[PDB]
Design a protein around this ligand. Structure first.
Ligand SMILES: *C(=O)CCCCCCCCCCCCC
Ligand SMILES: [Cl-]
Ligand SMILES: [Zn+2]
Ligand SMILES: [Zn+2]
Ligand SMILES: [Zn+2]
Ligand SMILES: [Zn+2]
Lengths: 277, 5, 100
């Protein structure tokens, strides 16, 4: 594909009276998970979660583990500071989430770099697209913004996101190319289930596709039936692929007025389906 | 990295 | 703090056929905070050998998890996923619909 992404998603969750906050990190290339870390594991280390990662040598895993353990400590201290900023009790559990990563564009350059944090499920602070400034989501976060501006934190992220982030992504894309670079088109079909003598559910299926981005719409007389379509969230097959369906309930006598349209980057051109008894 | 909030 | 209620989908990896080995999936998404309880049920009873994905989250910071286990569907057996989360009045149970 012309563009690719790498992301790390970390979750830190405090548990007052029950030890250190738990720390979980997962990394993704596009929609494929490739590593994990869990501080509650027997002997916490960064671990592969895609087979093409297993060829990285031990020094790779040692450095990633060092960096994650570093982050874990930073984020535990951060949880303490944030409970201060927010005047909160030491008795309650709180959650710090971070996202970071890079999009590689077809010109081989950084399409966009990211670093953002959330506290208890809400935006807290984000690195702006320019990789030189911050958006604080509230007054508490302005504490952080001020500290980070003074410490030149943005420039450190800019260097990472334009350099090592992209270099790493390029390497993973090469090491995993046979699966990461293969867009698998959805297998599609329509099912039909009478709900009465007079109406039926037409369900449009898309199965086994990669990546997860897809558009599935029902149309009648060339117009989207979005407000009559039940559309489920795109969901994992469990085998690295994704699934989705969309359904409409229609009068039996007008079943052939309905067509399902599917768009996927793995498709030469959009598909058009219909109920075919 | 080391950037505490 | 925000709270969001879990969405739940129960489904098989491959189209189900009686007597053929498959995978039973319960995909739980859009929830916050992250603590959550998920059980796969066979005829009302908890299945063993249930695995789950590593905790991740979406653009809106809401979490998602896939719970899954091997199964061989037959007409006699009923399957379901039961989810408990702080945002719920009580556990939500979603039956597997094998004919979609
Ligand atoms: C400080 O906030 C630590 C953030 C980690 C920067 C990414 C370094 C590259 C290795 C991936 C580790 C991801 C840990 C969340
Ligand atoms: Cl740790
Ligand atoms: Zn590509
Ligand atoms: Zn070493
Ligand atoms: Zn049916
Ligand atoms: Zn577990």
């Amino acid at each position: 594909a012309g563009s690719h992404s790498m992301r790390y998603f970390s979750t830190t969750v405090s548990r007052p009276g029950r030890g250190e906050p738990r720390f979980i990190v997962v990394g993704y290339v596009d929609d494929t998970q490739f590593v994990r870390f869990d501080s509650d594991a027997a002997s916490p280390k960064m671990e592969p979660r895609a087979p093409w990662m297993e060829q990285e040598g031990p020094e790779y895993w040692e450095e990633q583990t060092r960096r994650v353990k570093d982050a874990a400590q930073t984020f535990r201290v951060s949880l303490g500071n944030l409970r201060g900023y927010y005047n909160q009790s030491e008795a309650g559990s709180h959650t710090l989430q971070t996202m970071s990563g890079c999009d590689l564009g077809p010109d081989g350059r950084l399409l966009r770099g990211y670093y953002q944090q959330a506290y208890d499920g809400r935006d807290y602070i984000a690195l702006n697209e320019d990789l030189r400034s911050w958006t604080a989501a509230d007054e508490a976060a302005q504490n952080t913004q001020r500290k980070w501006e003074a410490a030149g934190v943005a420039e450190q992220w800019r260097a990472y996101l334009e350099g090592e982030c992209l270099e790493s992504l390029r390497r993973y894309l090469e090491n995993g190319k046979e699966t990461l670079q293969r867009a698998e088109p959805p297998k599609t079909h329509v099912t039909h289930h009478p709900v009465s003598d007079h109406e039926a559910t037409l369900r449009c299926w898309a199965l086994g596709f990669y990546p997860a981005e897809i558009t599935l719409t029902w149309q009648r007389d060339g117009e989207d039936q979005t407000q009559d379509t039940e559309l489920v969230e795109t969901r994992p097959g469990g085998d690295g692929t994704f699934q989705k369906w969309g359904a409409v309930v229609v009068p039996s006598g007008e079943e052939q007025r309905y067509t399902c349209h599917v768009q996927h980057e793995g498709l030469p051109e959009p598909l058009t389906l219909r109920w075919e008894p | 990295g080391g950037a505490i909030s | 703090a925000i709270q969001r209620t879990p969405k739940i989908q129960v489904y098989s990896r491959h189209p189900p056929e009686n007597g053929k080995p498959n995978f039973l999936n319960c995909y739980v998404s859009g929830f916050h905070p992250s603590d959550i309880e998920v059980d796969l049920l066979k005829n009302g009873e908890k299945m063993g050998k249930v695995e789950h994905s590593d905790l991740s989250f979406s653009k809106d910071w809401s979490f998602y998890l896939l719970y899954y286990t091997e199964f061989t569907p037959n007409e006699k057996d009923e399957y379901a996923c039961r989810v408990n989360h702080v945002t719920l009045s009580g556990p939500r149970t979603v039956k597997w619909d094998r004919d979609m």
